[PDB]
Design a protein around this nucleic acid. Structure first.
Ligand SMILES: [Zn+2]
Length: 178
RNA sequence: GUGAACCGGAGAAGUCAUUUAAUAAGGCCACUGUUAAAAAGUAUUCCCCACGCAUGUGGGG
């Protein structure tokens, strides 16, 4: 839904800096540099698995702190899907079918892999000629703002990530590289 | 005009206090430096230059 809060389109991209902090290694400014019609979907698909804790609005997502993600490789895309093809007993419920779908404590694969930790609404394209700040290809239309407001997951949810790694009690094993 | 361009790991700090290397020793016994010479009674003094050439005078290194 269209929440009244307005945020720049660069908040969904981690490598591109946003409000506060610094802007070195990526010389951009808010609301003047936008995203094309593919990088917006790139940012949208990154929501359920790489959502950071943040400041106020500590609730990150179904995995809290993002852990290591391990999966088996191949040499072709159709081949790549075969190694990691592990159907479960129940295929949960759709979470991208236009339904927010308040479920029970136990969740499923289709409702887990497509989580939406934040309400998101993208504004209409703006005419122009400039390129985006992620892939850099010149285009005709760009998106410059979005409506983002934080949402907390229900406490005590039961969900084991198929590609996650846990230490001893379900706590996420992150990367301790500084 | 190159995952590149633009870019300090920076500010600060007595290792100070105590201590004999001390007590002793013979380097001792043996050994010719010997055999040879005039600085002076010579027969060409190692080199240059003036003169007329009866084992000639003068001058300089
Ligand atoms: Zn792009």
């Amino acid at each position: 839904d269209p929440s009244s809060r307005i945020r720049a389109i660069t908040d969904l991209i981690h490598e591109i800096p946003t409000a506060h902090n610094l802007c070195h290694f990526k010389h951009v400014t808010d609301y003047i540099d936008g995203l094309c019609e593919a990088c917006c979907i790139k940012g949208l698909l990154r929501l359920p698995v790489f959502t950071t804790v943040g400041g106020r609005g500590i609730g990150a997502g179904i995995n809290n702190t993002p852990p290591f993600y391990l999966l088996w490789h191949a040499n072709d895309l159709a081949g790549m899907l075969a190694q990691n093809w592990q159907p479960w007993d129940n295929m949960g419920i759709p979470a991208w079918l236009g339904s927010f779908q308040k479920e029970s404590r136990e969740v499923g694969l289709l409702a887990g892999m497509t989580w939406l930790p934040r309400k998101v609404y993208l504004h209409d394209p703006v005419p122009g000629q400039a390129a985006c700040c992620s892939c850099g290809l010149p285009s005709e239309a760009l998106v410059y703002s979005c409506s983002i407001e934080v949402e907390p997951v229900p406490k005590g949810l039961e969900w084991k990530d198929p590609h996650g790694v846990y230490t001893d009690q379900g706590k996420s094993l992150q990367s301790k590289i500084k």
